[PDB]
Each structure stands twice: as structure tokens, then as C-alpha cells.
């Protein structure tokens, strides 16, 4: 479809709204410029003509060789820590005759990665209140997508959008996400380096949603250290880094990750205590949280909802907590029945008494 006009160049398409039944409407935008780039996405910024609001437009080739679940997964998602899909449409694009999907998302200016990179260049540590706020909101988005059976499979600091004025975090980049069905196998070399769970590095095809929890544990540890905790160009390199921290996995832990490795005689490396991994001033509660996330056995990792109930986030449940810029914290306690379905009795902890209003 598409068309050009003048207001600045105005683009008009017939786009389908992200929510509700399929009822496309004319949508006009202007002020187009290329902003972000990923391994698959090419994100434009634009300004909607009606409301003046800023949006991001991820334009992705619709490769029919691969499973393109991204639109179908995003359409069912509505949560305050997941970037909203306002509209989508199809356009002819640039590759002669080819099919390009356009996702019109809420525009969010920063990522956890770019914020953490400022502190590393300045040799400061990200203040712990932000580690708490950012990690808490991440786990809350994971509890939401996992309650639908959906695994993100690309959790990493570049995929976490921040509005740093409000400290609101939004998960994005669902182009690797999948609805994991037990008994059906999954492609194994998924997730980005530094954030791959050990069962994935061992080539497991029968993994679960808890790979996202391992990835979240790597983000947390990175935020606390100021650099990735398991760097490495290859799978062996990263597994060495994991083993130099957690120790050599037992035979039973190897069986939980991938039974095809249980008969090899790996050298037994002693674990490095978590208190020595991190800086001497690191809060003990963050270390305890990190050690219950970065676990070899996938069923022994915290679920995302259980992570939100952790004592590390206790300061967020104070009525008197304020952000460093003076504004109050974002909404943290408006849990639905859907995202509590994992374990409903955690509402006793997760909604503190001053927020039942």
C-alpha cells in the first residue's frame, strides 16, 4: 500500500492494531530516521501524525525458511514491562520482490546495556536501587510471558528498554521467542553468547523456560560486576568460565542438562565462592539471589515470580522508597491473576500492605 504527502514527508499506511480483533485503520507518521539495529531488526523512529507520539518501527524480512513467530507472540502480550505493539503492517520493502513485516512499537529511548556501559566508562557501579528496579521489572515480565508458556530465548541487556526518567523497564525483541511444548524439541543454539544457559551450550533440544532465568542471572551479575560474568567466543570458552565459578557440574547435574555427557570424566574444579566473585561491598542479598538463579540444574533455578518475592527486592516494597531524581517508583504491585497463576500465595509477599488500594 503506502503513500507520500506533505504536512515534512508524511507516510500513510493501512495498519492493523496490535490488540483486539483485526480491524485495520489508516495510520500516518512523519519524521522518519533509522535509530537502532539488531542481528535481525532494522528499527526506525517516527512521529505519529494524529497524536504526535514517538514510535519505533521494526522492519524485519519475513524469511519463509524460518519459523516467524514474532508477530503472533507479540499480539497476545499486554503487560507494563513488555514493549507495546501498537500496530503492524506489510510493505514491499527493498529486496525487489520480498515480504517485509513492520511492527509499530512504543518508542523507548535507552537500554539496560547502554546505561550499564555509562557506568563502566566512568568506573562507577550502577547504584543498587536501579539494579533492584531493573531486575525486578525483568522478572515480572518473565513471570507474565512464562504464564502463557512462552520462552523469550534472547534475554540480554540490549533487549531491555529503559525510560531512565521513570525507571520503567520494557522487555523487547521477541523474534526468538517460542511457546515451548514438552515433548517437542527445540533448536539448541539459541540465545546470545555470554547469556546462554549451560544446558544450551551442551546442545540440549529439550530445554524449558528456565533458560530465561539463567539469562536474567547473567544480567544481574553483569550489573553487579560491570562486565559480563561468562565471556568467551565459543561454547567451550563460556563453559570454562561457568565452571571456574560454579565448579565442575556433578554427574546428576550433567544429566539434568544433557544426558549425552554423563559418561565423560571431566576434571573436578573447585567452585569459587560467590562472595569473592563480586566486589567486597556487594549486598549479600544480591549475591544470594544470583546464586539461586545461576544454577546448573534447570529445575533448581527460581521461577521468575519467586525471584520477585526475594529479599533483595525488599527495599522496593517500602512505602517511603523514592528514586534518586525525586519521582516516585513506577507501578510495581499491580499483579493480575494471570501473572500470579504460577504460585498465587506469593501475593502475601508481592503486594505489600500499603499497595492494596
Amino acid at each position: 500500500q503506502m503513500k507520500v504527502s506533505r504536512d515534512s514527508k508524511v507516510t500513510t499506511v493501512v495498519a492493523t492494531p496490535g490488540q483486539g480483533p483485526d480491524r485495520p485503520q489508516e495510520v500516518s507518521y512523519t519524521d522518519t530516521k533509522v535509530i537502532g539495529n539488531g542481528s535481525f531488526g532494522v528499527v526506525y523512529q517516527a512521529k505519529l501524525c494524529d497524536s504526535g507520539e514517538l514510535v519505533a518501527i521494526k522492519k524485519v524480512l519475513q524469511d519463509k525458511r524460518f519459523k516467524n513467530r514474532e508477530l503472533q507472540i507479540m499480539r497476545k502480550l499486554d503487560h507494563c514491562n513488555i514493549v507495546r505493539l501498537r500496530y503492524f503492517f506489510y510493505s514491499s520493502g527493498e529486496k525487489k520482490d520480498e515480504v517485509y513485516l513492520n511492527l509499530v512499537l512504543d518508542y523507548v529511548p535507552e537500554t539496560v546495556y547502554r546505561v550499564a556501559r555509562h557506568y563502566s566508562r566512568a568506573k562507577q557501579t550502577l547504584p543498587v536501587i536501579y539494579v533492584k528496579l531493573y531486575m525486578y521489572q525483568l522478572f515480572r515480565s518473565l513471570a507474565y510471558i512464562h504464564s502463557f508458556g512462552i520462552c523469550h530465548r534472547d534475554i540480554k541487556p540490549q533487549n531491555l528498554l529503559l525510560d531512565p526518567d521513570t525507571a520503567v523497564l520494557k522487555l523487547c525483541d521477541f523474534g526468538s521467542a517460542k511457546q515451548l511444548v514438552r515433548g517437542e524439541p527445540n533448536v539448541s543454539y539459541i540465545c546470545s553468547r555470554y547469556y546462554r544457559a549451560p544446558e544450551l551450550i551442551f546442545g540440549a533440544t529439550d530445554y524449558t523456560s528456565s533458560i530465561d532465568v539463567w539469562s536474567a542471572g547473567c544480567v544481574l551479575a553483569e550489573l553487579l560486576l560491570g562486565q559480563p560474568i561468562f565471556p568467551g567466543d565459543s561454547g567451550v570458552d563460556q563453559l570454562v568460565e561457568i565452571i571456574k565459578v560454579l565448579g565442575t557440574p556433578t554427574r546428576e547435574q550433567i544429566r539434568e542438562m544433557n544426558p549425552n555427557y554423563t559418561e565423560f570424566k571431566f576434571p573436578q574444579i573447585k567452585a569459587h565462592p560467590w562472595t569473592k566473585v563480586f566486589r567486597p561491598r556487594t549486598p549479600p542479598e544480591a549475591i544470594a539471589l544470583c546464586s539461586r538463579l545461576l544454577e546448573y540444574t534447570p529445575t533448581a533455578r527460581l521461577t521468575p515470580l519467586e525471584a520477585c518475592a526475594h529479599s533483595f527486592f525488599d527495599e522496593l516494597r517500602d512505602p517511603n522508597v523514592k528514586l534518586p531524581n525525586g519521582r516516585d517508583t513506577p507501578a510495581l504491585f499491580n499483579f493480575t491473576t494471570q501473572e500470579l497463576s504460577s504460585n498465587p500465595p506469593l501475593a502475601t509477599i508481592l503486594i505489600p500492605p500499603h499497595a492494596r488500594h
Binding site: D237, V240, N258, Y261, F266, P267, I269
Partner: peptide, 20 residues
């Protein structure tokens, strides 16, 4: 994927070198 024999051989060789 990767053959489990070849991956484990590489990992074993790496783990022997860092073993304190």
C-alpha cells in the same frame, strides 16, 4: 549441533589446564 565426544574432549583439555 556438535558431536558430544569432540566437545567433551575439548572441554576436558581446557579444564585440565586451569585445574588448580
Amino acid at each position: 549441533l556438535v558431536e558430544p565426544q569432540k566437545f567433551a574432549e575439548e572441554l576436558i583439555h581446557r579444564l585440565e589446564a586451569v585445574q588448580r
